[model samples]
Target: PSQLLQSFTTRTTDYNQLINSVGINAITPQQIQRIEKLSGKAPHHYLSRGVFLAEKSLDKFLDDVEAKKPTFIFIQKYPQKEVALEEYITLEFARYLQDAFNIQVIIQILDDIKVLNREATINEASKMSNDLMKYILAFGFNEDKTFIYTDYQYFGKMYRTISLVEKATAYNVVQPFFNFEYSDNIGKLASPSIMTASMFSQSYSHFFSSPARCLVLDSIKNVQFHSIIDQIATTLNFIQPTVLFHKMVPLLSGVTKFDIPSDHNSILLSDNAKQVERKINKLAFSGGRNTTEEHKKLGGQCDIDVSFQLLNIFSSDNAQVKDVEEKYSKGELLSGELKKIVSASMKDFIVAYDAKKKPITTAYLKAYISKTKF
Candidate 1:
């Protein structure tokens, strides 16, 4: 992962259109309060920290979960040969939800021949499955519309197999971590290494259509094409899914956006705390003045500072983060001091995550989707 990040001091995405596009509502505080009350569970750090910024109908989805109804989440699959850190984080989020809600989440691989164009060589596991060219140019669809194809076996079987018209909650997730070679014919982006078939075989036993649906994305820019899945659910008469956009680690050069690869500010999952610290100290965009004297005289700008932005997501103690923010902006804290705090916070965050993953052997993964019915 570290090697891939440094290999390309790589790669612009335009989000103005996406912002202007009438889409899902930003997740409201009232909805969150209602969710906490209904589930009797505190919101996950990801949700509480504003890492996840928007939602459509999450309240209704939680209603199904609270009532012990069937719930499933689908994460868009990247090539197995090379999985990026961003992809890893996304899968982590899905699994986190599974454990938190005790619900089933499937890493859905899109296997449509027309969408991909080339026939993917299926691995021993079983069988399975971006940009404007990854989305728009290649798909020949606008940001407002999504193309749906149901004749394909996996999709057809999933819908065909449903016995009752139930309101199963489903989530379709998109994780675009880094820049890669785009396949024009396929209208998809390939990872830095060889784009290989899925390691985990395809299984639709756990898949189902839902009246409550959601599209989770790391950025609003990538939110365009993924609503296509919602198109399928909508066509099937499923209630329009919510689009929940999450907060991503901002590029070190700037904080206007939160894509790592597009700015070569890629922070690897394998990077230890020291490496994380080094990057934050050296590469992170600073909102401090030119010199110590100037910084002390003028104070820092928290709005544009990458370290503070990171602290907002990684730091567990909200009080501590707020203290840092106020002190830094008042020149009571130096840029170096703030980065150190962010480094320590991120280290603890990564360490906590390190212990959560189990070995993902095929049998173990298959077990996740083994049961056909929820």
Candidate 2:
């Protein structure tokens, strides 16, 4: 949104350009009031202003959000601490929505939505995704009215999306990005794109579902799914892409339980070495790591670490894929610039969100990590 276009996309666009196109004029003090009410603060006080992002992207997610579609956000142990998002550059994420549904459709079926304060594990939470989807559909929240929360990266493993569902109802499905000819990872093993058809294990946090399709939103620069990563995050993408598949312009990715970690009371649904327990049985990797053994073990990438690589490529104003490759490979960019950019943006969110911290729950937590920490 207002912040993401600053750095999260393959290219940077002026706020004014999108301001008019993205429905800034539609912002009513009353609508802003609705946001503050849900968020517990004055409109400006909320750093994760994804409600606005919701407005612009609603048009695209017809199979998702409420354009002609009616959608409701249902949660069990409502995320208590979720206020300042850093990974989500801004509200622009609404523009770049991607992936399946939550990495695995983790849901909390406490018999009541207010259920809270318990010992929940990433594994259990992920399992609950499928359960919740089943529960929702069992009750008739099926088809268009269905919107289950889940992780984007791991969605395919546990659930199917609108496209896949429709196709499956008609034909079948396969692989994470079935449209892509090959995997994008530089030195990964073979693309198990086919073998991973029915039960693929994956990571990546944040999830969503709708009647016609499933939107597993993890990657998508320039979009703030409203505090998923940044107090306010954002993203970019095609509105009417001539083709269903295109080279994702941005290098940003999504999250899963293994990356961020969703504790019992908090909203960190995606965790790393310090958060995961079942896999390596170690504290998931925090934000930064550089080594053969450790890196090999970590098995992923992170854009949040205040480091040279992420900062060099993503923090710049507008450096496309090739541009970033050239500059990053040659070490031409400095980390300080990105550090400054992130600092400035984050500072704004911190101050703005500090006032409304009460409703945000885990946005400011005493702690969540108790065991796993590598």
Candidate 3:
């Protein structure tokens, strides 16, 4: 998926704009406390380790769950082997919410129907849009939810107030602007546009479904685009949803080069123990000196070493990692030794992942993705 590719890019955005324009709110300490109090469980390791950096409106989502309402989650298409590690993080979070709160959840893939230019012309796109609207309306929208349009001025004099669904119908009158178009990257690959980040928020406008509560999990790379997503949801009168963004896995190589395995960029869940070991020993960036004498004199730089970072993330024993950090920083552990420990920790996780990860089937997918009577 392009999400994996976009995860590693160096980009910047304006925070002030995010707050003012989109009304984005950071997860407050009180919200976290409430979440812990309500869930009555320790936060997930991803949350505890600060890997899931930011959350928006999670407290409200939890409140909805407390009211015995179903929580809806929108995910991408089914994950393949290589990207399963990243997708697993999201799945685990969903399971955590379900188990902790004992709430019903609906997991739907955004890729239900991929629209393409060749497969459909303008008329066909319009027809599909109508069908999508029908699906959106069929979903269980909270009956009490309504958006009050207080500032709607009609004849340049009198203001009028109307419900959001009425406003949405008015917006649909201009059908020409709502045509599906491929973004730049999608055009380059000659692929469907709905999957890429550029057009991802656009898909919300097309196939948007309103539920009692919506929670989305994405990588931190999507943080900047949250405002755009919020804007689209507001336009569609879907109400505000919670979006949580987790941190990206740091790369093994010191340099970042797009789509180059030779760069030793990242480790996939599918990578074997031997491959992981090889990457750790040979490819991971080192903070040790070239010669043993210099290394012993200067000591290892744990902050910059990829091996230490990986071990910190994967190792279940905090004390062991702390001990390793102390020993490595004091020149007691060599670079090779540190790599050994890191690779071993990673190997343990790989073994456990293989045992615990459930096999996906079409039936399994259908149960999650198919629309049901609410």
Candidate 4:
């Protein structure tokens, strides 16, 4: 069988250009010698030169990714078996995103990471002392374009939402809470996540951590992305502009998508609420503004766009994307007609997606490819 499919994996990152973009070689001759004096190599690239693209070492990770031409992945250390399958996938999604776009991928690993519990701090994970070369020089790169990192548990979600055609430098945050939990159990702010309650209150996701979350440099631009924080982003109205955001909806999930799953009952409320949600990707506007006061701030115009890919014929409207930006503008169209179409389409997509996934189609297997070691 002199057949068709050869090597299934294609390089998401360019080996040559990717290295030079962040390697010591990218710096001036004098700086190159300084780095090489400590860690020598005739030619110094990020991975080859020393401890990989760091802070002081003429960083170009964001510059490279922002350019959206060459994608990158900076794995400083190998994966260890102790971490969950999900954690390993966090790195994989970076690869997945790279493959999805010519988008740059950077996977920085700890010199030695022994364990990753919800409580383990970064200091405990590494026994290695902070060398100026590693921490000082290569300790940079929006710390890796600050992708919304997650575990292997959610690969299917990535497979569903990202298409290589439009995503080069754009980042996608995780969507949905499984519609789960008690009132306080919001994923970013609740339990099960690695965050503490007080910490969760202090800007939950990596998005707001400034230096920690890779929000600095010039890589900010919302473009288009998945759920959560988006609610806050919407509430905040205009951000620093260097940062970017766009919300996607219809409650994306791998299985039981279009329709709620029989097993899916952990959400804050189910059909028991005597209310049916017409809006697709859960709206923050409906939440009582979390205030009832004689004097409240006059809200500004919300530039929200309600997009629905409605159920059934979905020609059933969710059309391409409905216009809800006005309704978000303090007040406008109060009709409930449009949201229903979008929500329905999501349920329908789930049904059809489930139908195809029952047997795992050939196409499905090809898209989500990983090389994990047990």
Candidate 5:
């Protein structure tokens, strides 16, 4: 089944062909006219080139317009000027979407504030921030909607500027690195760990305290999921079997879901959905006196179903297993290399599992497991 699934190729070549069919310079006034006729409204225009990349689900939105529903379009600008060709291609695609779909589009101008961080003094940071704002304003964003941030200091001078902007414009003030040391102190409460603390920490706590309207928690820091789960389990005093299943199944194939009996015993299932009724059925088991005729009889008596829903959740890839085997054979035993292999393997496992069962919020697990070590 794994081999069959891996061999089943999707339309990657067709997608590439479609992408190659349209040349950027070939966009004409007649094409725009045809698009306007097809779509109801005159398309909104944007000058962004390199900043906007993929238009995932943009076509679906266009289809919505065809069905006469209102749709909104937004563009996030990237700060790279060297990739002008790529930018031109992106802009051409954006124009195609707009003209062909009558999409109302807005370009959100992102201020490049790397200069502010490089500056030594607060005055320098302030000047650079002002310059960035001026640049953003020059791009025609309304003063009310524009905001800026920097990754300079630990609770830097820009906090005041961001705070002032929030107060006046009723727009969100985002500090990019609020909890920089989050992963370092994963277990401690006042240790500035985002994963250890509640969602209402830092700016969230401040905003709630001050009753501030537009304070945003845009901190992109490390969050430890294992630690967070440990804390939650400790607090609740009863951890669900699903949590343990989540942690272990990625380490082995075949075993999917474990059914807990009285919180002491767990029933393991093979990939084919055969229940391993006895303790000897576990991966840790080595056949001996434990594998007697009676035990074999009982094991054979265990239920097996093709639609073992749990197998869908924990399927493994032979390719990835091969890669790990290759790495180990090549003597790549460094901690960093092992960490990468483990992380990648776990990710693939979780994703395949999620794709099958559509179980509980795998989205959170995806986000959490990305930071997992070992």
Candidate 6:
């Protein structure tokens, strides 16, 4: 089956055209060549191959990349079992896009029950994960384009992972925390487990206190838009657009946009407190500013300045655009650049809102599909 899948993956132009038409234009001819050099094959087209199936405002990122702007890519690592070669190839194509466009890539590997259980112990597993993270970092990660993996269950597990790796490598590797919980509707309002605190602490210690750049929440499913914004604002001081929730909540009324309180806790709060309050508030405030009937009639309008400001907060120390040029000028290997751009592009998905000020749906695109090729 894998071989057959690989054979089908050989067809690349169709996917490339699909991405071009769909608006992931950050990929260029040079970057494509680099990807061929690195991955030893043509990369998959995210849109044509359905790797990046939905997005809110992809054109903006494509524009940024074309202008040589700095962007970030975020890759969600699936359990190895769940990952197919086609998926890997598709993701690698995203890497190519990052490199071609002078963006940064952050690969957040996802650990599974099998991977975790195989570890000698929970602590050992954490250390192993951190070691793996260092390997990724050495591959051009830096604070801007690198991140570690964390599931809801193993949020704090990376601390042990980092500690063990530091002892083995004799150097401290930075860790970027991620969330992998899948929620549907109001159910996501519930609190994450106690383990989330350890994850938060590790992230705070590694990224916030230090000079690490970029923070992302991976595979965020099922929560309301407002809830997600509040969580990001309160936890990481980042605010992605509200449009990303279009798939999870198709109704425009389901979109909820809110402000991050000035006094919101940046640290020291229990994980449960943070998770629960955010989730509950998200459910309670389903229809807010972005949901007005007038706004819906005219499509959605987001505060781009606010969004850029939030993104800048994470990359403040190092301007993303300047860093890309510097690395390129020095002739650095930029395999991970596309990853950063895609990660930033995903932010559009996070903030996508509908005319009704609610989340859009995958079905929204179905009207344009002429066939079921995938």
Highest lDDT, which number? 3
Writing each residue's lDDT as its tens digit, candidate 3 over 252-303 gives: 8542333432224777665687887788888888877788887788889876
lDDT (tens digit, per residue) of candidate 6 on 206-272:
3344322222222223122223233443444332321221111111111222221212311111123
Backbone collisions counted per model:
7, 77, 0, 30, 4, 29
Alpha carbon lDDT of each predicted model:
0.50, 0.28, 0.51, 0.27, 0.28, 0.32
lDDT score for candidate 5 against the true structure = 0.28
Among these predicted structures, which one has the highest TM-score? 1
Tens digit per residue, CA lDDT, model 1, 1-374: 11121212112222233333536566778877775676467766667766776665577777777887755554454332222335544555554565556555444444443245444443411232211012111212221222211123345444432321222212112222333334343234321111111111122333334333433434444444435444545445544544466654567876665443522474555466677777778888878888888888889988778878777765667789789988998898888888888878877766655443323334533443343223
Compute each candidate's TM-score over C-alphas. 0.65, 0.26, 0.62, 0.26, 0.23, 0.30
Poorest lDDT segment (10 consecutive residues) of candidate 4: 217-226
Candidate 5, poorest ten consecutive residues by summed lDDT: 240-249
lDDT of 4 by residue, 51-157 (tens): 12222212333343444433233322223323211122223323333343334332333322223323234454432212211221121223234332223322233
lDDT by residue for model 2 (298-337), tens:
4323333222222332232333433533443344433333
TM-score of 5: 0.23
By lDDT, rank the candidates, best first: 3, 1, 6, 5, 2, 4
Clashing pairs in 5: 49-87, 50-87, 51-78, 313-353
Every candidate's CA RMSD: 11.1, 17.0, 11.1, 21.7, 22.7, 22.3
Lowest-sum lDDT 10-residue window in model 6: 169-178
| Tens-digit per-residue lDDT, 258-344, candidate 5 | 222211232221111222222213321111123444333432210121111122222244454445444433443332343344444
- Candidate 4: stretches off by over 4 Å: 1-322, 327-332, 348-374
Which of the two, 2 or 6, has more lDDT?
Answer: 6
Q: How does residue 272 of candidate 5 score in lDDT?
A: 18
